[PDB]
Amino acid sequence: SSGLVPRGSTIEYNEILEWVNSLQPARVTRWGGMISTPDAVLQAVIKRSLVESGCPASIVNELIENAHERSWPQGLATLETRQMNRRYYENYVAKRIPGKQAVVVMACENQHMGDDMVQEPGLVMIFAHGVEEI
CB 53 within 8 A of CB 98: yes
Give Cα separations from 55 to 3, 47, 119 (angstroms): 10, 9, 17
> Resolution in angstroms for this experimental structure?
1.9
CB 85 within 8 A of CB 76: yes
Residue among 50, 46, 43, 59 at smallest CA distance from 9: 59
> d(Cα 16, Cα 110) in Å, to the nearest integer?
14
* List of E strands, the chain: 25-28, 34-35, 94-96, 102-106, 122-127, 131-133
Cis? peptide before 56, omega within 30° of 0 = no
Per-residue buried b or exposed e for 45-63, using 16+ beta carbons within 10 Å of the residue's own CB: ebbeebeebebbebbbebb
> d(Cα 14, Cα 89) in Å, to the nearest integer?
27
Give Cα separations from 10 to 5, 15, 110 (angstroms): 9, 9, 18
Within 10 Å of residue 119's Cβ, how many Cβ atoms? Answer: 16
Angle at 110 between CA 4 and CA 47, to 5 degrees: 45
Method: X-ray
CA 99 to chain centre: 15
Residues contacting residue 52 through CB under 8 Å, at least 6 positions apart: 98
